[PDB]
Design a protein around this ligand. Structure first.
Ligand SMILES: COC1=C(OC)C(=O)C(C/C=C(/C)CC/C=C(/C)CC/C=C(/C)CC/C=C(\C)CC/C=C(\C)CC/C=C(\C)CC/C=C(/C)CC/C=C(/C)CC/C=C(/C)CCC=C(C)C)=C(C)C1=O
Ligand SMILES: CCCCCCCCCCCCCCCCC[C@@H](O)O[C@H](CO[C@H](O)CCCCCCCCCCCCCCC)COP(=O)(O)OCC[N+](C)(C)C
Ligand SMILES: CCCCCCCCCCCCCCCCC[C@@H](O)O[C@H](CO[C@H](O)CCCCCCCCCCCCCCC)COP(=O)(O)OCC[N+](C)(C)C
Ligand SMILES: CCCCCCCC/C=C\CCCCCCCC(=O)OC[C@H](COP(=O)(O)OCCN)OC(=O)CCCCCCC/C=C\CCCCCCCC
Ligand SMILES: CCCCCCCC/C=C\CCCCCCCC(=O)OC[C@H](COP(=O)(O)OCCN)OC(=O)CCCCCCC/C=C\CCCCCCCC
Ligand SMILES: CCCCCCCC/C=C\CCCCCCCC(=O)OC[C@H](COP(=O)(O)OCCN)OC(=O)CCCCCCC/C=C\CCCCCCCC
Ligand SMILES: CCCCCCCC/C=C\CCCCCCCC(=O)O[C@H](COC(=O)CCCCCCC/C=C/CCCCCCCC)COP(=O)(O)OCCN
Ligand SMILES: CCCCCCCC/C=C\CCCCCCCC(=O)O[C@H](COC(=O)CCCCCCC/C=C/CCCCCCCC)COP(=O)(O)OCCN
Ligand code: SF4
Lengths: 156, 105, 98, 83, 70, 71, 115, 318, 175
């Protein structure tokens, strides 16, 4: 049908715009953030992929959890996640954010950020290299390229 | 009260602005320059009490130049009579009052 | 008098009545005073432009000047009042009676 | 000569902007009175014909008034054409 | 690269060319192709009104030369 | 030349206004055709409400706001 | 007439843009998403509390100085006059008083903010 | 036919803003030893298109504690004033020919501050309030000096008409007559557009995002477009004021091209400046404008009043 | 009454005055005064006073910004009032609007005197002058003439401004 073709093209256009421009909120916790700083460094230059740090959660598309989430910090992480306008995506960076990591058996550590927020991409490492984080970012872009919102609305 | 130091010293601190018939820049006249000129020259030295009565004609002309109330009333009468004649269909205004006038330089 | 003149005059009357009534804030009454100056400026400008009084074209400007000082004056008083009470409420200006 | 010089040197060391501002202001105040071209500016301002020159009615004894614009009488702007 | 910034600057220049060029073209087109008349003062407006009245077509830009003196 | 044309145009428009004012005012009891509002008998410059009053609105705008609105 | 049309078109374009912004995307607004943002934690007071301003005196001075610029705006027209000496004297006098006001407030520590 | 001209003035400016975002990003990248956007489209040409699509398909957020009417009005006012800035500019023929173009632009620029003020107040957020008060301070700092700078530079022109500036600079640029003013004027524009080192109302290093911290999606996009349009307009105004190109009445394309090149050069100058210096403190900006720029501006105003009288070089227009 | 432009602008002027006359809040009072200043600029421009309208708009724009600054610091209230958030503010606003409407209706349909005199209407275009001359602006020269003619006005105005600066310094001293 022509409607199917139209919604497919519009979804592709919409998906492309979102994947092309991804703004990750300027937010780091621990060790891994330093590696994130190296992804914005001249060698890798995430800005050339359309990726721009933005301080305000209201103007942010991605939240990169780069570091250990503690029990004292978890409410703040949840709050800043809830204030991101949709669509929003979460990338878990490093062992500490993935599953607690080297502080897994600690009284003051949340064992993985996925108990607090839903996670799209899990980047392993301690810390993941700037190439590892960049690979995870491109993987998230490929995942966004794959999603279909207008097709589901049309079929439903 | 009023200490006329300007008249005593011949200074003209603020008398240049009191009337519109007094030496405007580039000789630009007021819209009612002639009427105010006539009214001022009528009542120059006779005094306020005599001026308010003997120079009333010039003052009335000056005020009706300023506000044009009588002209507005006359034009309104013309317009309303024309409208009532038109509404019952006996006037037929001429072409040059309808925008069809042969223009002239 | 055209309708424009009556509109400006009634705007001045509204601003004067707004000043003469105080709700709680001194700032609102200062705004009403500044509105009265604005209405006077507009009225005098229309009168001068209509009658082609060339040399009077400068008096509205002078008018604005003596608005600002007055406005400035009021603002100064306000901060002092605030410094005494923490609010600009006219209720606190009641130490002196008739 | 020995006190104001030291004061000016210190002011130039510390507040060059104020020294420059006061120098420019003093020059702008003083030089216009000491200039031969201010009269030329006033004459140029007077020579601009903003409004119509209304002709004068001939009574018979006005030798300094021209009868035609190109007559030799009347003001001349040849001082302006070479300025 | 450093010359890869040039395409964006060129697109900027192409976009900024359009306002002035289009304004000039529209001024010529609407006023007969001769640089729409400027009336800063009332005398120039009176001149324009006289031209409009004597044009015989209600367009000020239609100019009548010596061929109206018979 | 412009002064002469302005004089003739104003006088012509006043004359047409007077002729129509006579036409409309047939049987108004005590109406004098062409009566002035000034005691003085000297010439008074027309009000521009006296000129385009009995005319169409487009040229009323052109006469009043034509110069102000032209940019 | 042309300027009013220009303003109307600009305002209409901005209003159409904001309407598209508010009516195109899917909205899922809940309580915590619309809360005030103060770095991740709940704010203590309200933003409508008094906010001390340390440059109030400079603000009043700006009010007085703003008026002075209005006076100097007509200087270009003023330059032409035939009484060039009088106009120059008055313009210089007005600017000298403006500079004297600035100097007086500077020396009286009026340009320094409150602590 | 005037609507076609309005659209031809509006749409290209918006496109130029969208692509100035790209130039700004690539210039900063190459000045910081990196590339910048080069993936979305060839040489990143489609990035601006990509940014716009994502911003207007994302949900706008209305704060619980924020006034809604003024919240909605503020971005509309900002964008509409940014678009209205361009109508009196001669390129070489203005869309609207005004006898007082400088005054109109100055008044509308003064009006543009209330968008930021009402955005900060209506958001009902502490950081927005801090940004709005910084905006108040900045405007108080810059307007007076900017106004006297305009008056002093326009004394030579003899009129407030923008068009007459081309005739004034037919033989030489104005910057060769008033370079000490131009410098200050340049800095003043940096303060008037809230640009580095005077990006204080939206200071991200202190105020997270400043006045528009609570804004998202479309309203934030409109604020961003208003910012960049004001940048371009002020640089065009500087080019017309101080760098007077020659005009051929039979060939205005040459003037348009030269003026556009100068405007682009000044915009690249702002982009270069942003990447070179740290940020001021909002009291340091006020002290710089009042204790340094104001005395020099007054002295140069006196000098430029006196100079045509001293040299018998008063400009024509009455 | 052609295009009703002057009358519409005057109505918005009075409407604007009513908004800040009500004293709902300093923030909205300033907004209303800005609106009235802009429409007054338009009214003055329609009569040929371009410079005066632009000047009053600039001065008010600058002045209002300072008022906003003062309001946040000292006139701030936890629950700011709008024209529909309070009984008396809405009452005053509605009373002003209805007085505007009734006076307009009586003066337009009828010819009634309010305080000074009555009116006829027919638009504000009638009072014009059809003056046809000049390579200059009469308003510009009149305003321009202050330096040449108002030597005394310049003196008193400059003295008043300097004294006003001194007055502000002295008043805000405290101690
Ligand atoms: C030093 O780090 C930083 C940067 O460097 C990496 C930045 O870029 C930067 C700025 C933020 C960037 C990511 C730029 C973002 C680009 C915009 C948000 C896109 C906005 C462009 C549109 C809204 C314009 C409209 C799009 C149309 C195509 C124009 C035509 C309009 C129609 C109606 C026709 C900041 C703040 C920063 O801090
Ligand atoms: C850039 C400047 C130029 C732009 C030029 C175009 C102007 C654009 C105008 C801005 C709006 C366009 C946005 C695009 C989508 C429109 C959204 C809305 O209008 O649609 C629905 C309107 O439907 C309403 O339910 C109303 C339906 C009926 C009620 C009154 C309508 C009566 C009209 C009679 C219709 C009969 C047939 C008409 C054709 C003959 C509202 O749905 P809602 O869920 O709220 O909001 C979320 C929308 N989502 C789903 C897309 C995310
Ligand atoms: C009795 C004691 C006197 C001294 C006391 C001083 C206190 C009073 C304040 C000043 C009073 C002086 C009166 C000056 C009024 C100005 C009018 C007069 O002087 O003539 C003018 C001359 O003005 C000159 O510029 C000189 C006067 C300017 C004075 C300079 C500054 C004075 C200020 C000092 C006191 C002010 C307060 C303190 C300031 C620090 C006009 O000249 P002209 O252009 O041919 O004519 C224009 C009219 N046309 C166009 C029809 C031809
Ligand atoms: C200045 C630069 C920007 C210019 C402004 C206009 C930009 C125009 C860009 C067009 C992009 C295409 C629009 C599509 C985005 C729609 C947003 C979206 O994803 O909504 C998905 C939504 C999912 O809903 P459900 O499946 O029911 O599930 C809800 C329960 N969980 O599906 C929809 O509703 C989509 C329906 C199509 C919307 C109509 C779009 C038509 C275009 C109108 C815009 C006008 C542009 C001119
Ligand atoms: C499509 C149908 C359009 C109907 C829109 C009705 C307007 C309205 O109030 O809508 C509110 C809408 C969102 O409401 P929600 O309930 O959250 O969204 C519902 C969809 N899920 O908000 C808006 O968009 C506000 C309306 C847009 C304003 C347009 C007109 C405003 C004009 C502003 C003038 C003031 C500024 C002038 C400055 C210029 C002066 C020089
Ligand atoms: C906000 C905008 C208010 C200021 C508008 C300024 C317009 C302007 O300056 O243009 C001047 C222009 C040209 O005049 P000159 O160049 O001096 O010489 C003419 C001879 N050729 O004059 C005009 O065109 C006048 C036409 C009408 C003036 C505009 C009036 C519009 C007022 C807008 C206010 C909007 C309402 C405010 C509240 C909004 C919601 C209620
Ligand atoms: C009547 C003449 C008018 C014409 C000239 C005026 C033009 C405009 C200039 C005046 C503007 C206002 C000036 C205000 C002066 C106030 C100075 C002041 O108080 O600041 C002092 C510092 O200023 C000084 O050093 C004192 C004055 C310095 C010299 C001023 C000029 C002296 C004469 C110079 C010019 C002489 C003539 C020209 C010759 C030039 C050589 C060719 C304190 O510094 P702070 O910033 O508060 O704090 C610093 C510590 N943290
Ligand atoms: C013969 C008769 C001539 C009449 C007189 C003319 C001669 C005048 C000679 C002096 C003129 C110099 C004035 C130039 C401007 C004044 C600059 C100034 O003095 O301010 C600086 C401050 O300037 C700055 O800090 C600027 C900061 C922002 C920098 C932004 C980027 C730098 C500039 C980029 C290039 C600018 C291009 C200018 C022209 C652009 C084209 C229009 C001093 O400040 P502080 O050192 O902090 O002193 C205060 C503490 N005592
Ligand atoms: S995963 Fe390793 S490098 Fe990253 S924050 Fe945790 S401990 Fe530091």
């Amino acid at each position: 049908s022509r409607g199917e073709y139209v919604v497919a093209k519009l979804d592709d256009l919409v998906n492309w715009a979102r994947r092309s421009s991804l703004w990750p909120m300027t937010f780091g916790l621990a060790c891994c953030a330093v590696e994130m700083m190296h992804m914005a460094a001249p060698r890798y230059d995430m800005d050339r992929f359309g990726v721009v740090f933005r301080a305000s959660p209201r103007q942010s598309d991605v939240m990169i959890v780069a570091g250990t989430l503690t029990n004292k910090m978890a409410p703040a992480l949840r709050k800043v996640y809830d204030q991101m306008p949709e669509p929003r995506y979460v990338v878990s960076m490093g062992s500490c954010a993935n599953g607690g990591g080297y502080y897994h058996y600690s009284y003051s550590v949340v064992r993985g950020c996925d108990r607090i927020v839903p996670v799209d991409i899990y980047v392993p490492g301690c810390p993941p290299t700037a190439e590892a984080l960049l690979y995870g970012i491109l993987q998230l872009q490929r995942k966004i390229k794959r999603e279909k919102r207008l097709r589901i609305w049309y079929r439903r | 009260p009023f200490f006329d130091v300007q008249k005593r010293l011949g200074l003209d601190l603020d008398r240049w602005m009191t009337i519109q018939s007094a030496e405007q820049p580039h000789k630009i006249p007021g819209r009612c320059h002639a009427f105010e000129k006539e009214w001022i020259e009528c009542a120059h030295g006779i005094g306020g009490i005599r001026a308010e009565k003997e120079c009333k004609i010039e003052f009335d002309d000056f005020v009706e130049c300023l506000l044009r109330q009588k002209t507005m009333k006359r034009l309104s009468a013309i317009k309303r009579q024309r409208d009532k004649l038109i509404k019952e269909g006996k006037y037929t205004p001429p072409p040059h009052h309808l925008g069809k006038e042969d223009p002239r330089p | 008098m055209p309708l424009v003149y009556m509109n400006i005059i009634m705007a001045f009357a509204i601003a004067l009545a707004g000043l003469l009534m105080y709700r709680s804030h001194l700032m609102s009454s200062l705004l009403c005073l500044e509105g009265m100056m604005l209405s006077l400026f507009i009225m005098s400008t229309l009168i001068i432009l209509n009658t082609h009084f060339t040399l009077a074209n400068m008096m509205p400007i002078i008018l604005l000047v003596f608005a600002a000082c007055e406005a400035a004056l009021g603002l100064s008083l306000l901060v002092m009042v605030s410094n005494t009470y923490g609010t600009d409420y006219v209720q606190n200006l009641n130490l002196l009676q008739c | 000569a020995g006190r104001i010089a030291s004061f000016l040197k210190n002011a130039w060391a510390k507040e060059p902007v104020l020294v420059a501002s006061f120098a420019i202001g003093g020059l702008a105040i003083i030089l216009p009175s000491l200039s031969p071209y201010t009269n030329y500016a006033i004459r140029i301002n007077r020579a601009t014909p903003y409004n119509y020159p209304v002709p004068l009615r001939d009574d018979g004894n006005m030798p300094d008034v021209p009868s035609h614009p190109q007559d030799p009488q009347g003001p001349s702007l040849e001082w302006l054409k070479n300025l | 690269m450093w010359f890869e910034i040039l395409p964006g600057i060129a697109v900027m220049a192409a976009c900024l060319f359009i306002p002035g060029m289009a304004t000039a073209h529209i001024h010529k087109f609407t006023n007969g192709g001769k640089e729409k008349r400027v009336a800063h003062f009332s005398y120039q407006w009176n001149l324009m009104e006289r031209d409009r009245r004597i044009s015989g077509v209600n367009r000020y830009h239609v100019t009548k030369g010596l061929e109206n003196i018979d | 030349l412009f002064q002469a044309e302005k004089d003739r145009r104003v006088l012509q428009m006043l004359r047409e206004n007077l002729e129509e004012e006579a036409i409309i005012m047939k049987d108004v009891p005590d109406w004098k055709v062409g009566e002035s509002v000034f005691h003085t008998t000297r010439w008074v410059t027309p009000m521009m409400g006296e000129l385009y009053g009995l005319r169409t609105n487009e040229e009323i705008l052109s006469a009043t706001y034509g110069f102000i609105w032209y940019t | 007439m042309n300027i009013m049309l220009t303003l109307l078109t600009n305002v209409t374009l901005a209003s159409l843009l904001v309407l598209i912004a508010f009516w195109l995307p899917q909205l899922n607004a809940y309580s915590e998403k619309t809360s005030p943002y103060e770095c991740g934690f709940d704010p203590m007071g309200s933003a409508r509390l008094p906010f001390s301003m340390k440059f109030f005196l400079v603000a009043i001075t700006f009010l007085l100085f703003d008026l002075e610029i209005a006076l100097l705006l007509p200087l270009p027209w003023a330059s032409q006059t035939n009484n060039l000496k009088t106009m120059l004297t008055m313009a210089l006098f007005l600017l000298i008083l403006l500079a004297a006001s600035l100097a007086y407030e500077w020396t009286q520590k009026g340009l320094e903010w409150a602590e | 036919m005037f609507m076609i001209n309005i659209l031809s003035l509006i749409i290209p400016i918006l496109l130029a803003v969208a692509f100035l975002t790209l130039v700004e990003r690539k210039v900063l990248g190459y000045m910081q030893l990196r590339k910048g956007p080069n993936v979305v489209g060839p040489y990143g040409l489609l990035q601006p298109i990509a940014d716009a699509l994502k911003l207007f398909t994302k949900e706008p957020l209305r704060p619980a504690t924020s006034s809604i009417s003024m919240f909605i009005i503020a971005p509309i006012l900002a964008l509409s004033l940014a678009l209205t800035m361009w109508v009196p500019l001669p390129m070489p023929y203005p869309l609207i020919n005004m006898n007082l173009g400088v005054l109109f632009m100055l008044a509308m620029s003064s009006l543009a501050v209330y968008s930021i003020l009402w955005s900060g107040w209506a958001s009902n957020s502490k950081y927005a309030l801090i940004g709005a008060l910084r905006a108040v301070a900045q405007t108080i700092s810059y307007e007076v000096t900017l106004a006297i700078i305009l008056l002093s530079v326009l004394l030579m022109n003899g009129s407030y008409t923008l068009s007459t500036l081309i005739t004034t600079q037919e033989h030489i640029w104005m910057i060769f007559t008033s370079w000490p003013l131009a410098m200050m004027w340049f800095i003043s524009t940096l303060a008037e557009t809230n640009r580095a080192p005077f990006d204080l109302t939206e200071g991200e290093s202190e105020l997270v995002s400043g006045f528009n911290v609570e804004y998202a999606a479309g309203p934030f996009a409109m604020f961003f477009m208003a910012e960049y349009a004001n940048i371009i307009m002020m640089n065009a105004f500087t080019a017309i004021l101080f760098l007077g190109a020659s005009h051929d009445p039979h060939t205005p394309e040459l003037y348009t091209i030269n003026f556009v090149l100068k405007t682009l050069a000044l915009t690249i100058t702002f982009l270069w400046i942003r990447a070179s210096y740290p940020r001021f403190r909002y009291d340091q900006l006020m002290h710089l404008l009042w204790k340094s720029f104001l005395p020099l501006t007054l002295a140069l105003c006196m000098w430029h009043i006196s100079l045509p009288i001293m040299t018998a070089s008063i400009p024509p227009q009455s | 009454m052609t295009m009703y432009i002057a009358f519409i602008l005057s109505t918005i002027f009075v409407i604007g005055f009513v908004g800040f006359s009500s004293k709902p809040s300093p923030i909205y009072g300033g907004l209303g005064l800005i609106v009235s200043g802009g429409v007054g600029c338009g009214i003055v421009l329609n009569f040929g006073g371009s410079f005066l309208g632009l000047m009053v708009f600039l001065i008010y724009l600058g002045g209002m910004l300072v008022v906003f600054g003062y309001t946040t610091a000292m006139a701030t209230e936890m629950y700011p009032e709008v024209w529909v958030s309070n009984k008396t503010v809405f009452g005053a606003f509605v009373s002003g609007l209805m007085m505007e409407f009734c006076m307009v209706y009586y003066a337009l349909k009828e010819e009634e005197v309010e305080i000074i005199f009555k009116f006829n209407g027919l638009g504000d275009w009638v009072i014009y002058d059809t003056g046809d001359s000049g390579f200059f602006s009469e308003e510009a020269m009149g305003i321009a003439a202050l330096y040449s003619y108002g030597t005394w006005l310049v003196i008193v105005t400059g003295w008043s401004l300097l004294i006003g600066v001194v007055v502000i310094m002295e008043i805000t001293r405290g101690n």
